[PDB]
Design a protein around this ligand. Sequence first.
Ligand SMILES: CC(C)c1ccc(O)c(=O)c(O)c1
Ligand SMILES: [Mn+2]
Ligand SMILES: [Mn+2]
Length: 131
Amino acid sequence: YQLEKEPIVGAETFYVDGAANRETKLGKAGYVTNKGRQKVVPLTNTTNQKTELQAIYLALQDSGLEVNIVTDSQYALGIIQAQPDKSESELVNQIIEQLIKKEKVYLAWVPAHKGIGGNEQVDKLVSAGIR
Ligand SMILES: CC(C)c1ccc(O)c(=O)c(O)c1
Ligand SMILES: [Mn+2]
Ligand SMILES: [Mn+2]
């Protein structure tokens, strides 16, 4: 697979986010799209970074052949921008299989809690009752 250098104009944009509880290890991954599409999935035995990759996997599963994904996860961004062929993580390998499936993917990064509206909406959905 290959990543777009710039946004696909007109393609549904998924804002993704995760939240995990350290003590309990319970979490939520989800997304919110510019088209009013939303998804929250509860999670068990997980970490912050696993919920962030899980949010991305969901975005890819539910999207369309061209897609824009906007994450606040430096960790997942590195994984995906490094374009591995295979990883030890089953989750990463599934993400990679999705990315080979797409015609165009554009992934961008934005900082957490800085007012970027789609990011902020999904943060409140995933972090409800968790943080
Ligand atoms: C501000 C801290 C708690 C934080 C860090 C990293 C994230 O990815 C987040 O999504 C988040 O809501 C909060
Ligand atoms: Mn996050
Ligand atoms: Mn968040």
